[PDB]
Amino acid sequence: DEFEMIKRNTSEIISEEELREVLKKDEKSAGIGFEPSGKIHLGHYLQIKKMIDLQNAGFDIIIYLADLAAYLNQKGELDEIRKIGDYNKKVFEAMGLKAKYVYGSEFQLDKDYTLNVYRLALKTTLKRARRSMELIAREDENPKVAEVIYPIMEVNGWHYSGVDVAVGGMEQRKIHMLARELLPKKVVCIHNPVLTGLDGEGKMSSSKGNFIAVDDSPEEIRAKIKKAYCPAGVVEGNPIMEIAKYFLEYPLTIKRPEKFGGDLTVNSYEELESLFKNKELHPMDLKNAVAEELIKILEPIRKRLL
Numbered sequence: 186d187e188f189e190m191i192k193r194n195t196s197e198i199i200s201e202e203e204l205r206e207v208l209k210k211d212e213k214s215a216g217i218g219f220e221p222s223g224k225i226h227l228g229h230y231l232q233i234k235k236m237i238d239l240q241n242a243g244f245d246i247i248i249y250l251a252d253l254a255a256y257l258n259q260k261g262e263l264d265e266i267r268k269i270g271d272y273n274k275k276v277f278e279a280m281g282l283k284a285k286y287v288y289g290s291e292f293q294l295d296k297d298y299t300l301n302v303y304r305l306a307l308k309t310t311l312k313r314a315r316r317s318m319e320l321i322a323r324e325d326e327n328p329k330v331a332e333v334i335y336p337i338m339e340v341n342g343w344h345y346s347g348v349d350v351a352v353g354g355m356e357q358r359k360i361h362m363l364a365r366e367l368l369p370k371k372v373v374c375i376h377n378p379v380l381t382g383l384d385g386e387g388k389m390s391s392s393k394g395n396f397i398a399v400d401d402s403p404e405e406i407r408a409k410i411k412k413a414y415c416p417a418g419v420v421e422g423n424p425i426m427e428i429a430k431y432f433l434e435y436p437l438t439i440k441r442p443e444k445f446g447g448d449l450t451v452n453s454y455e456e457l458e459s460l461f462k463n464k465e466l467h468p469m470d471l472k473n474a475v476a477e478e479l480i481k482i483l484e485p486i487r488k489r490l491l
């Protein structure tokens with residue numbers, strides 16, 4: 186059903202009971218925001234895929250091109266940030282998402298909005314605001330006051346958005362917790378898992394250059410996958426298995442030379458995981474299949490961008 190379709194491949198739903206209450210409503214809205222990113226990667230796509238799930242489930246979708254957040258988070262000047270946000274919109278549209286796109290700065294600098302930001306700054310401890318930014322803040326040896334304005338800026342955004350559901354990666358959870366504690370309307374928070382970087386050494390991120398971009402060329406995708414961390418039998422923190430879990434359609438046919446066991450059809454990610462944990466499926470053949478199927482999945486996106 187819709188709940189299950191929404192829940193599929195999420196890390197958590199802050200409350201399932203509250204989301205069930207939302208799904209009874211006819212008019213319901215879900216939002217996500219992104220600091221504009223020079224490259225749109227599989228992390229982004231995972232969340233937009235989830236936004237599409239909600240859209241299919243009768244939700245109106247709003248995407249915040251979070252230009253002011255990105256400004257607060259040291260991404261550059263607003264005019265430049267906004268150009269990147271416009272590029273990001275194009276990618277999201279190429280992904281098949283029709284939604285309303287709003288630049289946070291269209292409303293986040295209004296006088297009454299600001300006064301509410303100050304109101305929330307009185308209710309939010311520095312310690313809690315800092316903790317909320319631990320996975321989000323730009324690396325800074327000398328953390329700026331802007332870092333603790335960021336979470337109250339976003340919390341007030343959620344308040345102003347009027348959405349019933351907020352979406353983001355697990356790293357967003359502490360900011361979302363603040364929103365649920367501070368605001369008169371508790372937003373349902375759907376968190377998506379954070380993908381491991383291709384080298385398996387941290388989470389996948391724009392600043393770490395450890396991601397596959399939705400517009401990477403086939404040859405780039407093949408090279409990135411060839412080189413990725415993918416230890417035999419190891420599923421945990423294996424970025425290739427995660428791509429297989431989050432992006433691929435099943436039944437999945439894995440091509441292999443007969444000398445390695447010949448073509449392999451797997452009817453679910455859970456079978457794939459079993460075959461991989463049991464070492465019936467070698468990294469090399471997993472990689473080849475994941476690279477080819479991923480290329481196919483991203484191709485219509487790469488094709489539109491042009």
Ligand SMILES: N[C@@H](Cc1ccc(-c2ccccn2)nc1)C(=O)O
Nearest residue numbers: 218219220249251254339342343346
């Ligand atoms: N914290 C997210 C960025 C992010 C996400 C959402 C919002 C927001 C929500 C409602 C209205 C306005 N803005 N602002 C910023 C990230 O790390 O990409």
